[model samples]
Target: MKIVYWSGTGNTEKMAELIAKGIIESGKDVNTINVSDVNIDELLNEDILILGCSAMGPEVLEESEFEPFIEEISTKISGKKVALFGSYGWGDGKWMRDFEERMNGYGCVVVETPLIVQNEPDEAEQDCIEFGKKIANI
Candidate 1:
């Protein structure tokens, strides 16, 4: 499996690392990458495509790259299994809700509830680990 993430301030980046470790710790394979560095062909090589992002205040998702990437790849990823996670600010979890719903709309079997945290990840490290571990087995 592979995880692609976009983080403007690196908070979501750390989450991807934590979750990726969880996937590895549980004896499943996974790769972590900055969304900017990953291409569609690389995504196509994964067992299941994992994704991470975050909401900045009320910001839905970073529109410059991550959002557009998803827009482009959505057409190609139908029928693929996917998992999602991200950091959400103090706002409501609407970003993840919409994200999960969109992934479903794309015909992806989202294996778990999308993981989210309010801020700095160490506090959620264990939760992130467990989320990754749980995601790995399915």
Candidate 2:
């Protein structure tokens, strides 16, 4: 399993760290990488993939980097076990929902409903951890 994420305010990065902790606790090997450092070929080798990105600008993905990364890998992740998580400031989780739909369109088996938190994930840390455990088990 591997976790890839993008964070502007550190909330999503913290969530990724907690999720990686949960996966390690589950006795599984997991690599958590920033979207900037992720390699598409290496990413494709993983059986399980977890992606996290906060809702940016009108409930959309971070445009400069994260969105482009997803676009590049969209067609290559078919049938992969994938999950999503993120933080939002306002509005409904339309971004997360749309991301899930896109992954489904590519034939990825989205493992769970996306875990979304409002702003910083202070109290939501445990939820992120639990989400990780679930993904590890899958």
Candidate 3:
């Protein structure tokens, strides 16, 4: 499993770290890479890909790095299993909901409903870790 993410204020990045820890504890090879360092070619070999980013202004996906990376891989993503998770300080977590829908529209198999944290992770993040284990089949 590979987890790629872009974190603006470190909230979402922290989530990715915890999720990776859980995946590793489950005895799987889990790679957590920053969006900027990700190689699209390597993504092809992943059994699962987790995208994490914080909500941008106006309830949109984080624009600069993460969004562009998703766009780059969109066409190659069909048939691959995916999951989306993120943090939001405001709005109704609408960005995550919409992001999940868009991934589904692309024909990627979403493992579960998208996970969103208000401000930062609480119990919701633990749920995400559990969800991560499930998605990777660990």
Best by lDDT: 2
Clashes of 2: 0
User: lDDT for every model?
Assistant: 0.85, 0.90, 0.82
TM values, all candidates: 0.93, 0.96, 0.92
lDDT of candidate 1 over 1-138, digit per residue (tens) = 788999878889899998989989998877888988987887886768889888954657778888998898888887888888898777778988988999899888888888988777978899989988988888
- State each model's C-alpha RMSD to the native: 1.3, 0.9, 1.5
TM-score of 2: 0.96
Clashing pairs in 2: none
lDDT of 3 by residue, 1-138 (tens): 789998887888888887887787677878889999999998877867788889998888778888888888889989888878888996888888889888888889988777788776766677767766766672
| Backbone clash numbers for all candidates listed | 0, 0, 0
Model 1 TM-score relative to the real fold: 0.93
Give the runs in model 3 whose Cα sits over 4 Å from its true position: 122-125
Candidates sorted on TM-score, descending: 2, 1, 3
Q: Residue 21, candidate 2: how far off, in angstroms?
A: 1.1
Model 2, 4-100: lDDT tens digits are: 9999989889999988988998998888899999999999998878999999988899999999999999889888988999988887999999999
